[model samples]
Target: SMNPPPPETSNPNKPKRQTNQLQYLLRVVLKTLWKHQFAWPFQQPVDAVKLNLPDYYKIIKTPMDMGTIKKRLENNYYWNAQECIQDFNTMFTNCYIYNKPGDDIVLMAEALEKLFLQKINELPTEE
Candidate 1:
């Protein structure tokens, strides 16, 4: 018969950080968005859409076009991710009005939330 192994010890003071899938995904989205610094009043809408929106659309399981995206951006002046989120929500609402599926809208909202949070974090401290 083999001897039993010693029991492992757990630390009570320093608890492990537990994060869910959504949190992890949110972190990644925020990090990526911040790293790119693609906040609104976008100087290059076409390039911005090509670089960022395509991947986001894929995440939301939706098809995208440069012209439509460019047109949308041109129609509005987005000062921040929150503004963009509002635009996305409005578009989703319109889609629903026409009896279109809105599942991707939720994903888009999540991504926009992450981006907005990251932008907020980047704000200067008011010490």
Candidate 2:
């Protein structure tokens, strides 16, 4: 109900053009998502716990301050991503906007969020 299918490419000659445009759009969307996810809140470097470290780490150990969630929700990266994918699917049942059938945007977002959650669980307790 949210994502609308990309513009139809019924004309056979436009496959290359369509693919290029789609690739560009997906890159733009991903960049936008990254910027919003990490650059907002004054674009300060976040002290994220280093999950790559041997022991547990705290990418952001401190609990989010009040209003962080409310503020971040306005970014619209994940939400709009979901909405866009859903709308795209509805409009074009036979195809997706970016990735193939198994590489869904919504699922990717969820998986990414899950990874963050997993990292949280790996955080070392404060002494």
Candidate 3:
């Protein structure tokens, strides 16, 4: 006997407004990666996966900062590539991809993920 998935639940306090910033930024990131030989439209990166930008943004938003996303990843701890990409998208949502005050995307990306890999590695052995 299959129990109908216990009526889907929703959180009232959670924000309901959605945005497309994440999709826009992800496209930028992908284009940048393709242009730099870091990735291809059909290929995944070594540490990241090929993301469906629009689909991803449908679940998240922009105007998010790195710290917020970082803390979430630190607390939840993802173990698979999909989880990794989700967390990455969350981080991207919070952090501006390239439109920085000084156009410092290079340094921003470098500094942004500097501690992320280390944090990912710090996950429990089960991960």
Question: Predictions ranked by TM-score, top down?
Answer: 3, 1, 2
- Specify the highest-lDDT model's number: 1
Tell me which of candidates 1 and 3 scores higher on lDDT: 1
Clashes of each: 0, 11, 2
RMSD of 2: 20.1
**lDDT, model 2, position 122:** 44
Q: Worst lDDT window (10 residues) for model 1?
A: 1-10
Stretches of candidate 2 off by over 4 Å are 1-103
lDDT of 3 by residue, 1-127 (tens): 1212211124345433212333322343323333443222212221112232333333333323323333323333323334435545544433344235445543454444443444444433331
TM-score of each: 0.24, 0.21, 0.30
Give Cα-based local distance difference scores for all models.
0.36, 0.31, 0.35
lDDT for residue 99 in candidate 2, whole number 0-100 = 26
Question: What TM-score should be assigned to candidate 2?
Answer: 0.21
- Sort order, lDDT high to low: 1, 3, 2
lDDT tens digits, residue span 34-87, model 1? 344332322222232544434433333332222233333333322244433443
If both were scored by TM-score, which would come out higher, candidate 2 or candidate 3?
3
lDDT of model 1, residue 96: 44
